[PDB]
Design a protein around this ligand. Structure first.
Ligand code: HEM
Ligand code: HEM
Ligand code: HEM
Ligand code: HEM
Ligand SMILES: [Fe+3]
Ligand SMILES: [Fe+3]
Ligand SMILES: [Fe+3]
Ligand SMILES: [Fe+3]
Ligand SMILES: [Fe+3]
Ligand SMILES: [Fe+3]
Ligand SMILES: [Fe+3]
Ligand SMILES: [Fe+3]
Ligand SMILES: [Fe+3]
Ligand SMILES: [Fe+3]
Ligand SMILES: [Fe+3]
Ligand SMILES: [Fe+3]
Ligand SMILES: [Fe+3]
Ligand SMILES: [Fe+3]
Lengths: 159, 159, 159, 159, 159, 159, 159
């Protein structure tokens, strides 16, 4: 069996939006960790692993279609240097992915690959939550005030 | 606190060698996973998770010093279509790590960042041990026969 | 067996940087306790005991080398009278120790005492963490604002 | 057996400093409860019961001496209408008791009643802790700022 | 709250006698630990941990009063090369504590800090009991013989 | 992957040593057991067994470094004929080991063989500890006396 | 009680192929584990220890006969460079041992050391068990083929 070249591209293009996100997210939590937002550190680490889940899932698909999953390339990481920054820098990829995955899902249905369509419908819903979350952190950051908010991300005492 | 910019240079350099290997190693496994080489893929898979472990390990040391860890660059991946070829390409990476890290270790103690020295030293031991293993696979392929050796990386029944 | 007189001095000099730190740290936590930063109190107590670990370890070494461990002298304690103060007053010793232990480690290797070198390499890494921590508390104190931060060190309700 | 009339008075006078404190403390916690400082509510309730312990203990003594414990009278309750107020209103009795119990303890030794002296030495130490605490809450209230501090006395969410 | 500056004088004075003994006692143990006198070193070791316990105990009382506890001074240590000599030197310290503390106890009640009196009283009881023990070692050395007595502080086989 | 032939020489040189201890010690222990010093025997036995530990771990590096583990060589055995004697025989070895190994360590280090160093850095520490032990016996042998000490190496009752 | 030097000559001499066995078998199993014949390796190794127990039962009785165990005389090792020799080698010592013991059991029963008789009988039974094994290994090697036998000696996957 072989997979359709325009899917293969859309997959291997999500594969990278994954590889890309894995690093930022990971590194972002490790930084959250070093500044001392350990509570929050842990959760950014959580989302990070979630993306390695997605990559491994996309990878699984490509090989089934008999394509060559691309681990070699990467996206351009926005790397926030404050909490706020980082959330933005993250929403950054998240939306992109959505922007990339909407028409690609229908592209799939046209191409008649129901399995890869559902792979991507799921990533969408997953990511939408990541988004609603990230952007909520913001909604809340202004309601509370960076400062105050930030102590909601440390242990007692910190680290 | 603030580390020595060359040492950091060396550390953020290893962190690349590392992500290279994670990606490379992972892909080979999922690759052997495909060909039905399931027992083996679990092993290869495990090696990747170590290289992940290493990566965060270097990442930690970086932030403690102060440096900005590079989760943005990736070395050039070598992927072998066959098992034997796959073995070569990973030796390929490790032997490089030994080269990078030997002189590197000596310099670290020299510049008096002993802790970052001990770190790399450990790495070396693992890295050697991964090599011993991989070269030993290459002989068992010879001694046993590429086919017969291959019959030993599938389960019962296969995949 | 006998130990080399320049090591013996470096050991017995770290022995005191230990005895010294044991008191400040201890007293510092007991004060953190009395003001009411009990969460934090507990952790300063933690680091304190860690140093009595180091002293007892240095002491173990000296006797092996057949030297006379010096419990009689002490260092000059910087005793902070606010949280912030204290962290500084602590980083105070921590760096010193590092400053004292870098060339002493190589001194050891020259002298060819691998065991006492490793004793001190470990203290270094330990202390570097204490440092990264202490100085992080600072990084965070300014990001959060003494006040806010400080309630991150009490129980609910306080004491 | 009969007890010495000047002790009896000192006992039955502490008996009331007890009955008095039981109400304020209790009522004070119940108010802390209704405003919503439940964490803190619970602890004021704690000290309250501690005083009913003391009353019952004083009472035990008087009957042994064959006196008539006086449950009929009461002291004048300072009833705080803010957290701060209350702490003051409490330290209010606490010091009094100390002020009353120092010379009374020696009065006892003169009178040669070692048992009732020790009853009161204990109350002293108990109360000194209550004091150091209360007054610490203050020390901390200014360091933190009423507001901030106060949320250190609620549950998540409040009540 | 604020204690009586002379009493505090007395307390911060005991806290010195204490750190002296901790350091002295600990070192003797690790000292008997070396000579192979292992069973005995555990005992001596334990005595040190009590003196630590005492120290924090005095430290606590200090802060409650208000005084600044002296973790900066240390008395003059006497270290015996032999077991018997080692015994003398620790009697040396305790008998001093009895001298310091007797008159001290009387003054405390006098000045009407009964609680700090009770404290020292306790200390005395322990301090006497440590003395009883140490003098009794000195006789068993006599009765039994310094060698034979020494055979009773090693395990089986020795260290 | 091959290892530096000088190192492999030093590695092999420790190997024949360790094999000499495995044999020296083991016999001693048994002799000790046949003497009635069963308590002592056990201990010595645990030292020969741990000797064997190093032998294997040295064999490990050797094989990995691709040289040839020497199991034909075997230094000269001096087999003690008094308890005291055996002690002195075995200190003999532990010093030759320390005498060959302290210099031999830096060679490894300089010749960029980090792991081989750490290997021996550890054998060293053990040797120092076993040396310490053995001289601590002999000091104890003199303080107690031969009859006295020996008796601590018998079970009660003997054998 | 003293021993018959005819036997004491035998016993001590059996100790020799004994100690020589230990060494040969041990190194082999390390070579085998090292080549990747880990399943095979485990068994070889077990024989190594199975041999140390023979050295011990020998070393016990030698001492029981007021004899004098020899731990200096290592017999001439044969060292296989492939599984086929290794078997052959091992099978060599095992046979030598058989031809030296056959008579021995007669010299013993004659000169009247029955106990040593039954010791050496037992050693023999084992020696045959390991010979019956070493030759089946040689057959299965012919019957199945070398590559093929070799593949039942790796785990799955190979080490
Ligand atoms: C780039 C491609 C990567 C892929 C496909 C990948 C995949 C995975 C998978 C499948 C897991 C197991 C899922 C789980 O345990 O929940 C995992 C865990 C983990 N990942 Fe990754 N990962 C990647 C990169 C990274 C990076 C860049 C880091 C760190 C910077 C990292 C660090 C870790 C660690 C430390 C674990 C758990 C360790 C363990 O349980 O053994 N990985 N990853
Ligand atoms: C100055 C040299 C000192 C040394 C070498 C030393 C050593 C030790 C050691 C080895 C331990 C056990 C480790 C553990 O339990 O985790 C310990 C525990 C402890 N230390 Fe110290 N210490 C010293 C001074 C002090 C001081 C100044 C204080 C208080 C002001 C103190 C208070 C304590 C207490 C209360 C414990 C635990 C009590 C127990 O478990 O019995 N020590 N110390
Ligand atoms: C005025 C003289 C009083 C005395 C001598 C007294 C004595 C005691 C004693 C001995 C206890 C048991 C100790 C324990 O459970 O820990 C207790 C518990 C308690 N007290 Fe009082 N008390 C007094 C007044 C009050 C007042 C004014 C209140 C409330 C406004 C109160 C409410 C309670 C409650 C609700 C309990 C626990 C309920 C239970 O476990 O049955 N008491 N008291
Ligand atoms: C040369 C005379 C030796 C004697 C008499 C001896 C004695 C023994 C015996 C009786 C056992 C356990 C037997 C069993 O469980 O079946 C043992 C365990 C062991 N043998 Fe030996 N042994 C000798 C030499 C060696 C050598 C040459 C090596 C490797 C080079 C070695 C490595 C070990 C190890 C590593 C263990 C237990 C694992 C550990 O504690 O690390 N031994 N020894
Ligand atoms: Fe994703
Ligand atoms: Fe996400
Ligand atoms: Fe690596
Ligand atoms: Fe690796
Ligand atoms: Fe330290
Ligand atoms: Fe520290
Ligand atoms: Fe009361
Ligand atoms: Fe109270
Ligand atoms: Fe004391
Ligand atoms: Fe004491
Ligand atoms: Fe050794
Ligand atoms: Fe040793
Ligand atoms: Fe055998
Ligand atoms: Fe045998």
């Amino acid at each position: 069996m072989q997979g359709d070249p325009d899917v293969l591209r859309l997959l291997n293009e999500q594969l990278t939006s994954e590889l890309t996100a894995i690093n930022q997210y990971f590194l972002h939590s490790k930084m959250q960790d070093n500044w001392g937002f350990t509570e929050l550190a842990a959760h950014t680490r959580a989302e990070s692993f979630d993306e390695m889940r997605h990559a491994e899932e996309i990878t699984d698909r490509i090989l089934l279609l008999d394509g060559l999953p691309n681990y070699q390339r990467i996206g351009s990481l926005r790397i926030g240097q404050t909490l706020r920054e980082q959330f933005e820098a993250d929403l950054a990829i998240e939306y992109d992915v959505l922007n990339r995955l909407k028409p690609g899902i229908v592209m799939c249905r046209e191409k008649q690959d129901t399995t890869s369509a559902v792979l991507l419908e799921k990533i969408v819903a997953d990511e939408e939550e990541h988004i609603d979350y990230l952007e909520t952190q913001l909604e809340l950051m202004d309601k509370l005030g960076e400062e105050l908010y930030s102590a909601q991300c440390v242990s007692r005492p910190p680290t």
